[PDB]
Structure formats: structure tokens, C-alpha cells
């Protein structure tokens, strides 16, 4: 069974910072490209960040709107992925999901429950 679970969401002040975590199991994490997607009340569902596997230099990619403020990272031995958010904006309010590329489907087939980030 593929399992993903986000944590770390909450109420934060504009300009503030917040770190989200995602615990995973049930697929080969070393191969996986991992992702954060948010459901913002302004844009709806939108991809935020991607981190490639070790064999592709753990390379990171970001939506233009968060590039420079957000950092996506991974721990392969823990099989976790993280999103450090800095200089948070009203725009960033929303439900944050971790997902990625694994199992038999090369798209976001399995998502976590989502964690709510509210920028006051």
C-alpha cells in the first residue's frame, strides 16, 4: 500500500516561515521524483515543487511564484520529503499535498491527506 502523510501546516504571519514534512511508505523511494502540490483558494490545484531522485542529482524545480522562497528537500533513508517555506505571502494560503512519481503510474496518482497552511 502506497502511503503518504503531510505534517507541519498551520497559522503563520505574512513574512513568516513554516516547514512541511511528508512521511511515505509502500513504494521505492530511492527512484521516486517527489512533489508538493497545493490547493490555493486563489488558483485552485497547482504544482509547487519537484525534487528528482539521487541519480538525477536530487535536482529541484519550483513554480515561478515560490521560486526563491521555498526549498524542497528529501531524506532517502527516512523516505521523507520536505517543503521549507520562507517569506510567506497571502497567496501561499492553501492545502498542501505531497505526492510524486512511483508505483505503476508516472503521474500524481497517490496524494497525502493534505495539511492546511493559513497566512493571516
Amino acid at each position: 500500500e502506497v502511503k503518504l502523510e503531510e505534517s507541519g501546516g498551520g497559522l503563520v504571519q505574512p513574512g513568516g516561515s513554516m516547514k512541511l514534512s511528508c512521511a511515505t511508505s509502500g513504494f521505492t523511494f530511492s527512484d521516486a521524483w517527489m512533489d508538493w502540490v497545493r490547493q490555493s483558494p486563489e488558483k485552485g490545484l497547482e504544482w509547487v515543487a519537484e525534487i528528482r531522485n539521487k541519480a538525477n542529482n536530487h535536482a529541484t524545480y519550483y513554480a515561478e511564484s515560490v521560486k526563491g522562497r521555498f526549498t524542497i528537500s528529501r531524506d532517502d533513508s527516512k523516505r521523507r520529503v520536505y517543503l521549507q517555506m520562507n517569506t510567506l505571502r497571502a497567496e501561499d494560503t492553501g492545502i498542501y499535498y505531497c505526492t510524486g512519481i512511483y508505483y505503476h503510474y508516472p503521474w500524481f496518482a497517490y496524494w497525502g491527506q493534505g495539511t492546511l497552511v493559513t497566512v493571516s
Binding site: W47, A63, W107, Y110, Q113
Partner: protein, 113 residues
């Protein structure tokens, strides 16, 4: 990025009716491998989007045959036959042919009397 649009935003029906959702992309969703990566998710209140139909027409685990997906290129349709209460929610189409993956704005399937 590829823009995905759904018609309508809100889709009121009667229980037992057929409902059909339109999903259009700003770009062909045919990948270079010749396959089309247009998917549908269903989301219930307070929950995550759950994969419903993948690659136009394939039913995900546990999804009943009342759900049928069709279409090609830039124009796609989800047909929900004989709507039941368990089908209510917000349906999203999404493309994963092109990077970044993008999502339609959603369609709320709801009962009106």
C-alpha cells in the same frame, strides 16, 4: 503551462440522471509515446483528490463502470451515468503529458430538486 478548463463549474442534477463534464486543454495532450495523459480526480469535502479515471478512459482501483471517460487531443469528457449520492463531490481533470502537470478548476456535482 497547459491551461485546463472545465464546463461547468457547478453541475446540478437529479439522482439517477446522467451527468457529463467537459474538460479542454490549451495544448494537445498526446505525448511523444503516442499515449494521452488526461486524468480525472474526485474530491469530497475536507479530503484529498482521489484518482478516478486515468489516461482518458481507464478506471482506477474500485471505480464503478458508471464512470466513463472519453475524448482526445484537446477535448475530453467524463460521463457519470445514473448519478448516486456517493458520486457527489468536485471533479477535476488534469494533464501529465507536459511539465508542469496542471489541473482544471473543478466541477461540483450536486443534486437539485
Amino acid at each position: 503551462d497547459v491551461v485546463m478548463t472545465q464546463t461547468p463549474l457547478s453541475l446540478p442534477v437529479s439522482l439517477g440522471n446522467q451527468a457529463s463534464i467537459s474538460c479542454r486543454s490549451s495544448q494537445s495532450l498526446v505525448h511523444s509515446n503516442g499515449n494521452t495523459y488526461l486524468h480525472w480526480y474526485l474530491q469530497k469535502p475536507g479530503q484529498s483528490p482521489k484518482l478516478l479515471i486515468y489516461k482518458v478512459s481507464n478506471r482506477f482501483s474500485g471505480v464503478p463502470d458508471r464512470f466513463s471517460g472519453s475524448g482526445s487531443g484537446t477535448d475530453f469528457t467524463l460521463k457519470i451515468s445514473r448519478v448516486e449520492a456517493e458520486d457527489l463531490g468536485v471533479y477535476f481533470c488534469s494533464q501529465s503529458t507536459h511539465v508542469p502537470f496542471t489541473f482544471g478548476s473543478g466541477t461540483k456535482l450536486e443534486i437539485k430538486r
